[PDB]
Amino acid sequence: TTILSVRKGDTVVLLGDRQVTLGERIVAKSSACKLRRINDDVVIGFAGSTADAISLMEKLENKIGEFPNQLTRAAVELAKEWRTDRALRRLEASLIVCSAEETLEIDGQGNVITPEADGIVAIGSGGTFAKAAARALIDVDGYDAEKIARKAMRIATDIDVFSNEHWDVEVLEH
Amino acid sequence: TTILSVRKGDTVVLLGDRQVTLGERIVAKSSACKLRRINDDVVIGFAGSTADAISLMEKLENKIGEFPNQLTRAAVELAKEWRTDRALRRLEASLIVCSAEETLEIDGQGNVITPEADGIVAIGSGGTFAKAAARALIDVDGYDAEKIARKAMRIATDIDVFSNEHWDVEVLEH
Amino acid sequence: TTILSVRKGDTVVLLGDRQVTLGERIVAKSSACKLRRINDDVVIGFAGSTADAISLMEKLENKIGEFPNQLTRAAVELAKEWRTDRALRRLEASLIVCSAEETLEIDGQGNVITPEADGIVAIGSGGTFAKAAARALIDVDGYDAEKIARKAMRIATDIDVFSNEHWDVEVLEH
Amino acid sequence: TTILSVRKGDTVVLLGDRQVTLGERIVAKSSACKLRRINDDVVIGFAGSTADAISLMEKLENKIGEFPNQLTRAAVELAKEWRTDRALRRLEASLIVCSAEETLEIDGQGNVITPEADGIVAIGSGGTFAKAAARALIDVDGYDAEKIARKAMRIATDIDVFSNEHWDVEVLEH
Amino acid sequence: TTILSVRKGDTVVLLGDRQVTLGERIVAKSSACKLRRINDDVVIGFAGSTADAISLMEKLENKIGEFPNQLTRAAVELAKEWRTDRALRRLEASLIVCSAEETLEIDGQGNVITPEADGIVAIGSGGTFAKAAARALIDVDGYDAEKIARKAMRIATDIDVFSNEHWDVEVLEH
Amino acid sequence: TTILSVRKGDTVVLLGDRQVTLGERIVAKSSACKLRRINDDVVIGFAGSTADAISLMEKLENKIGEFPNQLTRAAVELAKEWRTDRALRRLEASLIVCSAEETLEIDGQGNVITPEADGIVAIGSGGTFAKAAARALIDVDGYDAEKIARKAMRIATDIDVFSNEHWDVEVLEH
Amino acid sequence: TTILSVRKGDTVVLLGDRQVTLGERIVAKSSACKLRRINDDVVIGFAGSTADAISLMEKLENKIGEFPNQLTRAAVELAKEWRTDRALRRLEASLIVCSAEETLEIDGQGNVITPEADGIVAIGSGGTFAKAAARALIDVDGYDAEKIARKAMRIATDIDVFSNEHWDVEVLEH
Amino acid sequence: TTILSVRKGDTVVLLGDRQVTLGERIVAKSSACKLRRINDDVVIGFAGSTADAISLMEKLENKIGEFPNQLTRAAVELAKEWRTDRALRRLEASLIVCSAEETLEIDGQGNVITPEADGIVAIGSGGTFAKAAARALIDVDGYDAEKIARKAMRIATDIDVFSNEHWDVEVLEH
Amino acid sequence: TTILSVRKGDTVVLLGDRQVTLGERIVAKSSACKLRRINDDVVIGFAGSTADAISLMEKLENKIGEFPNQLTRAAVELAKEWRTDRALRRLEASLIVCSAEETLEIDGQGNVITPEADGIVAIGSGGTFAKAAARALIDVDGYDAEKIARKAMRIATDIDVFSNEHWDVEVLEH
Amino acid sequence: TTILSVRKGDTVVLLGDRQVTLGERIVAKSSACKLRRINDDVVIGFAGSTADAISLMEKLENKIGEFPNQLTRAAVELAKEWRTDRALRRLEASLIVCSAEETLEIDGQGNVITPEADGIVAIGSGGTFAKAAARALIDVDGYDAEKIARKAMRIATDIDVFSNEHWDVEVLEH
Amino acid sequence: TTILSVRKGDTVVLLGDRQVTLGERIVAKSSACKLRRINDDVVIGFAGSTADAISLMEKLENKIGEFPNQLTRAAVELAKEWRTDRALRRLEASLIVCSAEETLEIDGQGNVITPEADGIVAIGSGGTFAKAAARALIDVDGYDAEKIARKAMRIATDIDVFSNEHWDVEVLEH
Ligand SMILES: [Mg+2]
Ligand SMILES: [Mg+2]
Ligand SMILES: [Mg+2]
Ligand SMILES: [Mg+2]
Ligand SMILES: [Mg+2]
Ligand SMILES: [Mg+2]
Ligand SMILES: [Mg+2]
Ligand SMILES: [Mg+2]
Ligand SMILES: [Mg+2]
Ligand SMILES: [Mg+2]
Ligand SMILES: [Mg+2]
Incomplete structure (x- = not known):
């Protein structure tokens, strides 16, 4: 998987490839969507299985609803819950969450990573x-x-055997 | 095990072999059925043990009853429950679920896979x-x-030591 | 351990050896009985420890009482409970259950195996x-x-270092 | 550890060595008693730590009290509870229980072993x-x-580096 | 693989299946011959790869030529060389060698096994x-x-996922 | 890697992909040739590293020169040398060798596999x-x-993450 | 395997069982002889494969011939060669060597063990x-x-799943 | 860690070193106190981390309060609770408890060890x-x-890379 | 380590970082040179230890001297020797060799990789x-x-904890 | 094993226990001598098997003969040879070598240890x-x-399950 | 072990601790010298065993003799030989070599490390x-x-459980 977010100027984009691999060997699907719109202002991309990622997205939505404008605080609360809850810890996934203002990466180790000044965040193999x-x-x-994101995805997915050349794109402004 | 579904035109077929293997070494049964009709519109095939597969089939039926026409949503809700419930995670199985309209593959990693345009889905060794x-x-x-499915099964089961030459067939139309 | 059941004509027999082995090395007992009569119509044989097997036999009796004549259904319900209950999953055993009509084998992987047309089922090393x-x-x-069973046990137990030459026998008719 | 019971004629004896070993390397105590009198009719010997063995002895006393004369049934009920209870399964021990009538061995794998006609049961390295x-x-x-038990202990404990030459003895008659 | 030899009366037969399996998963060939005629009086069957087995068959021929009628001595000399020569020990194979008089089995652990009075020897999974x-x-x-051999093969190869239903046969008399 | 050979009628083709993968993770090259013409009558394809495969191709040339028309014998002699020589056994590779008459597959386990009547042989992930x-x-x-080979490569390389969509082709007639 | 030697008075006996086991699971032969007469004054018994044991016996004979009456020195020289020679170290076996005067046990770790005053030496599982x-x-x-040796064998072989009830006996006097 | 208790005549001493080591490699502190006075009559020393040891000291105090003068019974009750409670079993520590009358050593394996007649008990690397x-x-x-204890600590701590030369001392009389 | 070669137009550059890391944890040197000029036309960069890399460079110089203008053939001969020679296989390194015309990457798995049309080759973590x-x-x-190479090194070495910000540069033209 | 040397005043003693253990479990001999006199001025004690230790003693004698009075230099030359010779490195042993003047301990890791001013050296479990x-x-x-050595052996061998209470003694003066 | 070299101005010092540790647990010697003067101009310090280090020091002296003033070249030649010679690679050691002009560190991975401008090199735990x-x-x-080196040793050896407080010192000038 390759999920990539690039913020430059007043645009942020989020791109994900569409390959699903089993046993670290075989492509079981080449047209899977790895991005979700959770509301008008927020998109999310995932590495991991459909069920794992959706379970975490639903917990994120609980947090986002409990902390209306504070995306960062919602992400941190999610990561806390994820690390301390027995069932959630048995899940494997990584997320990137974007709004026009903020991008966060959250993983199963409990890191919550915001980009450097260059605006770039990425997950997956x-x-x-x-x-x-x-x-x-x-x-x-x-x-x-x-344009940066498309070029970067072509190059990354040509190198990564676990990602393919077909990409979904989300864009946001403010 | 080989479970194969092929949709072409207005027909979908679901085929499964009949071998049960223990210790990855010995055939304990050569006439086991791996397909189940869950209602008039829905058939399911399984890789995994009788008890593991039937337990997951029953949870699927709960979901199918809770989301009447939305087979895809039922599958996803099943996969979510499967990944987050402690008892279900100790089960090993994969499922293919067919209606005339939709085919889904669900595995223990939490993938929910629909076919490409070619209408083909398959599971098992x-x-x-x-x-x-x-x-x-x-x-x-x-x-x-x-005809595609039968030819494909002959070929796949000749190669896989863990599947045999005897197959069950289910067909659906709309 | 060798447990063997053979159905031919209107007779079914169930035979088990009597060796108990520790550490996969030493015979701790050479006269252990591995068969149980659970009622007039039903006998059961086990591989695994006394406590493990008896705990499962008791659960199988619950299921047999809850599904009076449907010995196949009772076996499947047992297997489902066995695979999903945390305490039972820590047990190691295999069972063969016989009535005059039906023979089933049930193992800890959740397989439920009925014989082919030849009427033969067996478990143990x-x-x-x-x-x-x-x-x-x-x-x-x-x-x-x-006669088939006795000959087969002599041959199987001469080969298997984990089974001995002393056998218990149960017979049923209808 | 060596625990040995011999029944011959109207006498049964139960003998145990006195070595406690740590890390499978060092004698931490050479004078530990491994036998207990649980009432006038019943003695027990243990391999395993003080706490592990005493916790199991106390459960065995519950069972003995619940099945007054049926020492075999008590042992089997103990073994069942031992194999299905999460806390008790984290214990490591083996027991020999004697009355004048009966001797049983119970271990953590759930075996309950009565002697052959020779009256001999034994546990430990x-x-x-x-x-x-x-x-x-x-x-x-x-x-x-x-006389048999003393001679056998001298021979066994000379060979087993994990047992010593000092022995406790209990005797019973009827 | 299944190689079976049966001697009864003045006839000895040697049978082998024809399946070649890779990675313990896939049939790469279903028509491989596992028997060789080494002269008019001597046939040999092998489990293991073509190269491994043929390398050991050649060394066996050296020994057979060096000990003309003493098939048992040749087999033993082979097994000695096999266990002590660095290159041969990197090979994995088992052999059955037949003449009208004698049958021997030789394996990589250095066993040389002659049948019991029943005249039966076999190797492979x-x-x-x-x-x-x-x-x-x-x-x-x-x-x-x-007739015994053919029946026994059908039964064995039905059970062994690593052997198939197609068999080669060699016969010898004196 | 995917190397595939198909013989039908008087034509045999040999095809290979062009992806080189390091660490089972990354494409280091997408335009590597995996086929070699060793003379006018013989072509060879390889899975494995350049150096490993070439070293084995050179040894195969020795054997081909030493057994001029007997391509099967050369392959078997190669496989024997490969399995018994210390340096060659540290190599990892598989080969397919074609003439107009014969196709053989040789692997590091010492298998030498000729096709079934369908004329098809293949190696690689x-x-x-x-x-x-x-x-x-x-x-x-x-x-x-x-036409068969091209279609089969498109399908196989779409599924195998370790093979790509760019193929080299060799053809032979007689 | 059980090999046992007992010297009492002017008699020494050497006994061995006859079971050969493969994979630590199956009896491949129940009538194998594990004793050899190497001359009129010397007998030897072995645990390990035919080839491994015979190769070491042959080296022992070299030593016995190089140190005519000094059986103890021969054994030590053998053990030295066994431990320092690359090929012999890949062998697994244990030996007991008896003369009327002396009994020695030699193993692959390089121990050379003579009995205590009780005259008893034994090897094997x-x-x-x-x-x-x-x-x-x-x-x-x-x-x-x-009489001692026969009684001890009955006992030892009843307990050891890797030894059987059929024994060979050698006797020596002076 | 080295904790050592010596009782001679009417004096008992308890000594401990002061080194805390991380990763089995580095001294993180060289002045840590490993002895605690729990009342006027009772001192205790610990191997293990501050938190692990203190948690077990607290549970020991519970027991000492529940069994006022019976130090041995308190130690045994502690050990029983330690071995059966899930949380406490994830702790690693060993304790020595002293009064003027009694010394007991309690470890995570559930041993409760009292000294031999020499009055000496010790724990730690x-x-x-x-x-x-x-x-x-x-x-x-x-x-x-x-004087004994000091000399013994100088010697022990010079040898044990996990103990240092700085010691705390407690003394008791009656 | 990061070694990077970029060919664009008539210029090829080779750059390497200067960090030496031990135990995958600590920088032992931050100013090590990883590039060597082997003659006026040929430069080489290495990942691996000084001794390992120099031993392989020397063998590469033998080959370059034995195949004067054919850099590619020299590299391939080196890789062959490296994979088949016992001493060289105990070395761990990867090399990039540049001339004005040709760039090759050689690793310990025996891959010899030339760049795609973009002229880019790289090795190391x-x-x-x-x-x-x-x-x-x-x-x-x-x-x-x-300019490409510098910018790429800044980026790569900022990410790779095993590479630093200090670079050596070699340039070639024709 | 316990081998202990104590030098005090003009006397040095060397003591060794007599237990030989197999499988780290059983005493195979309780009367084995582990000391050797190699000449009038030099004695040696060993941990390890008879053959291992004697092979090293013989190499030590070569060195002692090549460096007549320089015991330390002989030991070092031995240890160098031991670490660099392929056959000797497959041996497991430790030695203590005494003269009146010098005591050295040599192990398989290549340490050569002389005592501190206290004159004490020891090896074995x-x-x-x-x-x-x-x-x-x-x-x-x-x-x-x-008197020091005897007391120390009683104590050490009471604690070490791998050493017994029976000791050999050698003494030297000058 | 701690070996430390510091060059400042016209002085270079080399310091080593004196602890020898076995099994990563016990101090076997506290007064071992880890420095050697190889000639008037050159000193060396070692981590590893006596025999391992001395064997490598002797090979270094061969090189130093073969390249009279070029210490760096000698080191590099040593490291090459060390990595490619089968016997030397079975050794474990690290060296620091000093002259007045040059300091090099050489390890078993084949690194040859010279200091930064600060003149500091160190090896060992x-x-x-x-x-x-x-x-x-x-x-x-x-x-x-x-003064720098002494202070640095007090600090490093207080932290490292595998180094002690006793140090040897060598000094050089030009
Ligand atoms: Mg890709
Ligand atoms: Mg099949
Ligand atoms: Mg048996
Ligand atoms: Mg003992
Ligand atoms: Mg089959
Ligand atoms: Mg692909
Ligand atoms: Mg037996
Ligand atoms: Mg210390
Ligand atoms: Mg960096
Ligand atoms: Mg002892
Ligand atoms: Mg220190």
Whole structure:
């Protein structure tokens, strides 16, 4: 999996590939969507299985509802619950959550990672490749967010055997 | 085990072999049925032990009854419960669920997989061989769903030491 | 352990050896009974420890009382409970259950196995050897169920270092 | 540890060594008693730690009180409880229980072992040696139960590095 | 693999299945011959890979040539060389060697096994099932060596997921 | 890797993908050739590293030179040397060798596999998928060897994360 | 395996069982001889495979020939060679060597063990049980060496699942 | 850690070192106190982490309060609770408890060890060295309990890389 | 370690970081040079220890001297030797070899990798990050080989905890 | 094993126990001598098997003969050879070598240890306990070397389950 | 072990602790010297056993003799030989070599490490603590090399349980 978010100027984009792999060997599906719109202002991308990721997305929505505008605090409360609840700890997943203002990455180890000033966050077996490529383009004038993200995904997913070339895209502004 | 579903035109078929293997070494039964009719519109096939599979089938029926026409939502709710409930997580099984409209594959990792446009889904040690063979025939005119499935099963079960040459067949239309 | 059941014509027999082994090395007892009569119509044989097997037999009796003549259903319900209850899953055992009509094998993986048309079921470290020998004789006219079983046990228990030459026998008719 | 029981004629004896070993390397105590009198008719010997063994002895007393004369039934009920209760399964011990009439061995795997006609039962790292030696003497002239048990313990505890030469003895008659 | 030899009266037969399995999962070939005629008087059957077995068959021929009529001595000299030579010890195989007079089994652990009075020897993942079934028939009316062997193979190979239903046969007399 | 050979009528084809993967995770090269022409009559395809495969190809040339027309014998001699030579056993690779007449597969376990009557042989992580798909098409109208092979590669390499969509082709006739 | 030697008075006996076991699970032969007469004055018994034991016996004969009357020195020289030679160290076996004067036990760890004053030596999975039983009887007047050894074997082999009830006997005097 | 108690004549001393080690590699503190005075009559020393030891000291105080003068009974009750309670079993620690009359050692395996007639008990990685040295001096002229204990600690802590040279001392009389 | 080579137009650059890490934990040196000029036309960079890498560089120089202009053939011969020679296989390293014309990567698994049309090759724990960043910039205006390489190293070495910010550079033209 | 050397004044003693243990479980001999006189001025004690230790003693004698008075240099040359020779490294043993002047301990890790000013050296599973007890007594006036060594052996061997109470003694003066 | 070298101005010092530890648990010697003067101009310090280190020091002396003034080249040649010679690779050690001009560290992984400008090199379990402390003082005026090293050793050896407080010192000038 490769999930990549790039914020530049007043645009943030979130991209995810569509490959589902079993046994770390075989592609079982090449058209799976790994992004979800949870409301008008918030999108989320996941590495992990459908059930694992959706269970965590539902707990995130509880938190987001309990802390209306404070996305960061919702993420942190989620990560706390995730690490201390016995059932949730048996889940394997990583998330990236975006609003126009904020991007957070949350993983099963309990890290909550916001981007550096370059606006880039990524997860999955391919995420680090994507991040490296996006970082190479972030400051090159005339490359907006979406153009950076597409190029970075092509490069990351060509390298990662666990990600494919078909991508879903979400965009946000303010 | 090989469970294979092929949808082509207005027909979907679901086929399963009949071998039960212990210790990954010995055939303990060669005539076990791995398909179940859960109502007039829905059939299901399983890899895993009788008790493990039936326990998950019963939970699926709860979900199907709680989300009457939405087979996909039932499958997802099942997968969520399966991954988060302590007792169910100690079960090992994979399921394919068919209606005339929809086919879903659900596994213990929490994946819920629908087919590509070719209408093929498969599970078990032999499933991927079956899928490769079915894919080779899917678009060859004059091979209908059942003919594709039978040919694919012969091939997959000849290769997989853990599946045999005796198959059960279910068919659905709309 | 070798537990063997053979049904031929209107007779079914159930035989078990009497060796109890510790550490997979030493005979601690050579005269242990591994068969139980649970009522006039039903006998059961076990591989596993006394306490493990008896705990499961008691649960099987609950299920037999709850599904009076449907011995197959009782066995499946037992297996479901066995796989989903935390305490029972810490037990290790296999069972064969016989009535005049039906024979089932149930194991800790949740398999419930009925015989092929040859009427033969077996469990334990020696069970497969017994089954192979019984299958060789099942169709030879003049060998009734008890004669087949005795011969098969002599052969299986001579090969299996974990089973001995002393056997208990139960018989049923209808 | 070596615990040994020998029944011959109207006498049964129960003997245990006195070595406590830590880390499978060092003698921490050479004078530990491993036998207990639980009433006038019943004695018990243990392999395992003080606390583990005493916790099981107390449960055995519950069962003995619940099945007044039926020492076998009490042992079996104990073994059942031992194998199904989460806390008791974290204990490591083996027991021999004697009355004038009956001797039983109970271990953590859930075996409940009564002796063969020779009247001999034994447990611990040295138990099998003791048993072999006692079996050699059981039928020989001049050797009553206590004389057999002493000789067998000398031989067993000389061979087992985890047992010593100092022994406690209990005797019963009817 | 299942290799089975049965001697009854003045006939000895040697039978082998034809399945080659990779990764303990997939049938790569269903028509491989596992028997070799090494001269007019001597046939040999193998479990293991083509190269491993043929390398050991060649060394066996050296020994057979060096000890003309003494098939047992040749087998022993082979087994000695096999266990002490560094290159040969990296091979994995078992052999059965037949003449009209003698049958020997030789394995990588250095065992050299001649049959009991029943004349039966077998090797491979299915060998013990075959032997059990052949032993059930060895003394029964109407069954010569070949008939016993064919029946025993059907039974053994049905059980062993690593052997198939296609068999080669060699026969010898004197 | 996926290497696939299909013989139908007087044509045999050999196809391979071009992906090189490191650490079972990353594509280091997407344009590597895995087929070699060793003379006018013989082509070979490999799974494994460049150096490992080439070292074995060179030894196979020695054997081909030493057994001019007997490609089967050369392959067997290669496999014997491979299994008994200390340096060669530290190599990991599989090979498929074709002439117009013969196809053989040779692996590190010492198997030498010729095809069934269908003419199909395959190796690599994707080989079995390719074989299943090719077997589905082998007997169907309109499909010559090359058309079968291309279709089977597309299917196999779409499923295997360790093979890509770019293929080299070799063809032979007689 | 159980090999036992008992010296009492002017008689020494050497006994061995006849069971050969594979995979620590199945009896492959019940009539194997584990004793060898190497000359008129010397007998030897072995635990381990035919080839392993015979290879070491042959090296022992070299040493016995190089140190004519000094059986103890030969044994030590053998053990030295066994531990320092690369090929011999890949062998697994234990030996007991008897003359009328001397008994030595030699194992793969390089121990060379002579008996205590009681004249008893034993090896194999059952050896220690045999020793314990022999030691119980060694000083009981009217039990000569052979009577002790037979009784000890019955006991040891009843307990050891890896030894059987059929024994070979050698006797020596001076 | 080295905790050592010596009772000689009417004096008992308890000594402990002061080193705390992390990762079995690094001294994190060289001045940690491992002895506690729990009332005027009772002192206790611990191996294990502050939190683990204190939690078990508190439970010991509960028991000491529930069984006012019976120190041995309190120690046994503690050990029973320790071995059966899920939370307490995840602790690692060993304790020595002293009064003027009694010394007991209690460990996580559930041993409750009282000294031999020499009055010496010890725990920790260094405890057995300390015990050996104290035993050498226990019966020698010119050495009272404290002098023995100091000398034994210097020796033990010089050897044990996990104990240091700084010691706390408690003394009791009656 | 990060070694990165970028060829664009008539310029090829080779860059390496300077960090040496021990135990996968600590920087032992931050100023180590990982590039070597082997003649006027050929530069080489290495991941691995000084001794391992120099021993392989020397063998590469033998090959380069034995195949004067054929860099590719030299690399392949090196990789062959490396994989088949016992001493060289105990070495751990990876190499990138550049001339003005050709770039090759050689690793301990025996892969010999040339770049794609983009001219980029990289090795070490950071190499894949560097490659991803360099691939993002390879086709963009304003960026020559050296500028690409520097930017890619900054990015890769900021991510890789095993690579630092100090780089050596070699340049070649033709 | 416990081997202990104590030098005090003009006397050095070397003591060793006599227990040989197999499988870290059973005493196979209680009267084995572990000391050797190699000439009038030099004695040696060993932990390890007879053959291992004697092989090393013989190499030590080669060195002692090649460096006549320089015991320390002989030991070091032995240890160098032991660590660099392939056959010797497969041996497991530790040695203590004494003359009147010098005591050295040599182990399989290549340590060559001389005593501190207290004159004490020890090896084996019990060695450290012996050392601790000897150190306690070394400076107590009126305890000579032999009295210290005997007391220390009683203590160490009472604690070590792998050493017994029977000791050999060698003494030297100058 | 802690070996530390500090070069400041015209002085270089080399310090080592004196603790020898066995089993990662016990101090076997507290006064072992870990430095050697190999000639007037060159000193060396070692972590590892006596034999391992001395064997490598002797090979270093061969190299130093073969490359008279080029200490660096000698070190590198040593490291090459160390990594490629079968016997030397079975050794475990690390070395620091000093002359007045040069300091090199050489380890079993084949690193050859020269210091940064601060002149500090260190090895052993305590080496990195020593280095850190020496780096804090290196630039503080009035702290010469020997004063820095002593302070750094007190700090590093107080932390490392595997190093002691007793140090050997060598000094060099030019
Ligand atoms: Mg990809
Ligand atoms: Mg099959
Ligand atoms: Mg048996
Ligand atoms: Mg003992
Ligand atoms: Mg089969
Ligand atoms: Mg692919
Ligand atoms: Mg037996
Ligand atoms: Mg210390
Ligand atoms: Mg970095
Ligand atoms: Mg002892
Ligand atoms: Mg220290």
